[PDB]
Amino acid sequence: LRVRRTLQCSCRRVCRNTCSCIRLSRSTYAS
Amino acid sequence: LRVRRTLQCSCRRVCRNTCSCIRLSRSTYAS
Numbered sequence: 001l002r003v004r005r006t007l008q009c010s011c012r013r014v015c016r017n018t019c020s021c022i023r024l025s026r027s028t029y030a031s
Numbered sequence: 032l033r034v035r036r037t038l039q040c041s042c043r044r045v046c047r048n049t050c051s052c053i054r055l056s057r058s059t060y061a062s
Contacts, residue, residue, distance in 0.1 A: 002042065009040035011050030017034075019042030019050035 003028075 005021040012018040020028040038054045043062045051059050 003040070003048070004042060005040050006038070007036075007040065009034070009036040009038070009050070009052035011034055011052075015047040016045045017050045019040070019048050021040035021042075021052070 003019045003021050007021060007023050008025065009019075009021050010025060011020065018029075022028060032053065034050055034052045035054075036052060038052060040052045041059070043049045043051060043060050049060070053059055
């Protein structure tokens with residue numbers, strides 16, 4: 001329901017970019 | 032500076048969550 005941490009930070013367009021923080025650039029979400 | 036990786040990862044609501052990653056020490060939205 002939320003994204004936060006201190007590792008790898010990736011963002012994706014979505015009305016205002018999306019926030020995904022994860023060790024692996026895996027598909028966090030499909031929506 | 033701006034949204035970067037390998038530092039601090041933070042996010043905030045804005046129609047679909049926003050992506051804000053920084054090394055802190057600066058005022059970024061702060062919700």
